[PDB]
A = this chain, B = another copy of it.
């Protein structure tokens, strides 16, 4: 079998076979040397001595509110700290990208073929003696047994960080522009060839789709007006393909950039809000530029909404998730004197870790109604009946579920949780602890250390036998949360590098794009740099209801 099956090289050293039964580790620029890249250079020894653990840094960031209150109000200091957050996180991501599901060695095919998700760790080779390499049993435990014993919800567990359904549906809407698995090809393939925040879930992945969604007047997107309210246009009107069951009324087959967004009314809620936002920005640019044509109005509005998106994701969405007293900043200028690649490739493991289905409540509570999953799915009538204003008021008030901590996946989506496990295995993912090492975390030494409790830990012990073959996805959902937090350590320390790299890697953040003229002047630039989740709702939802990502 492959000599690298045991994953011998440490500290991001790379393993290469050098014969049928021999390997060599390439320790180049790891800060380590020796056969397995485990002997630290002098400087590396010193660095390791002084480095705080993630849990220590997390502590500091979530305490001393009074100090952070001062720090937040000193621009130079706030910039310094945000610059360090961006650079230190982004360093953990290979860019240009390297591995994918078919290539555990660098190749021009892996580099150039955008239909692959990339891989933060290479796949376990096909001929390895066990699923995780050489450790553990010949087969992993039955994925249904793992699902049922430690993932499925008994009683709803609320997010102690107070995340609401505005947050949950924003997470789903936002991420599904770059998590778009090409199931015809397999789980390691994506249909999101822009590999990031290009707003294809509003505008369409292809030019043909985009042009069917556009009005071709004033830069705007097509729309319909039902009961005096602006909604996306229909499938029949646009000839845009959408996923809908056969029984859906013609005028409820809303057509939007992302074909799956008819799945759930919470998605259609944001699709509608962003469509309105695009057309609003068109109106503003037309006022500013009476001389501009439709094409420039459309393109410049798209750039502005991309900037708005990144602004809101950092300063509202990630701010909320972080739990930090430090005030995050969206500021491309922070990187202009740093080394940083303005490109990104979406990682399979980023997709996996973002399967946050424990957020979902047992019912969807709008106004006085409590809808079941069966009532809520593919049902845009609910959106039309209550209206956007009521959707926002209700979802702002409704608490979402905790993601880490175990046993909180709604049984309505149990098949999704099982697929995340089955597809992880199909893509030959390395183990939880290999991923922890990859992101500078200490391997867990027991199941009880992983969960912080005894009962799930024992079920896991019996299923997996060795902590070193525990799987990434179920680990994320059973991991001991930070104190009163929605996530455990592995979720944040993997998620944050992927997230921030992906956000700042966008070309609009590069120096030649990050200028007023890119966005039609100071007016368009300011739309980006003053965007918030509250302003997005205030500008585009009748009555300007209050909103927030927390209850």
State the A residues within 8 Å of B (CB): 3, 14-20, 24, 26, 28-29, 94-96, 98, 103, 105-109, 111-113, 194, 198-199, 207, 288-292, 296, 299-300, 302-303, 306, 337-343, 507, 510-513, 515-518, 520-521
Contact = CB atoms under 8 A, between A and B. Distances in A.
A477 to B, nearest CB: 30
B96 A507 contact: yes
Nearest to A518: B106
Nearest to A512: B94
A26 B510 CA distance: 16
B291 A108 contact: no
A17 B105 contact: no
A40 to B, nearest CB: 19
A349 B287 CA distance: 35
A303 B106 contact: yes
A14 B106 contact: no
Contacts of A17: 289, 291-292
Given A19-B289, A339-B339, 5 more contacts: A96-B513, A103-B299, A107-B299, A107-B303, A342-B343
A188 B511 CA distance: 25
A299 B105 contact: yes
A11 to B, nearest CB: 14
A187 B299 CA distance: 23
A511 B291 contact: no
A17 to B, nearest CB: 5
A338 B103 CA distance: 29
A340 B103 CA distance: 27
A291 B510 contact: no
Contacts of A199: 108
Given A198-B112, A515-B26, A521 B107 contact: no
Contact of A507 (B18, B109, B111, B515): B111
Given A108-B306, A513-B106, A518-B106, A291 B28 contact: no
A217 B337 CA distance: 48
30 contacts: A3-B291, A14-B515, A14-B517, A16-B520, A17-B292, A20-B291, A24-B517, A26-B515, A28-B515, A29-B515, A95-B342, A96-B343, A96-B513, A98-B513, A105-B296, A105-B299, A105-B300, A107-B296, A107-B299, A107-B302, A108-B198, A108-B302, A108-B306, A109-B299, A112-B194, A337-B339, A339-B339, A339-B340, A341-B341, A342-B343
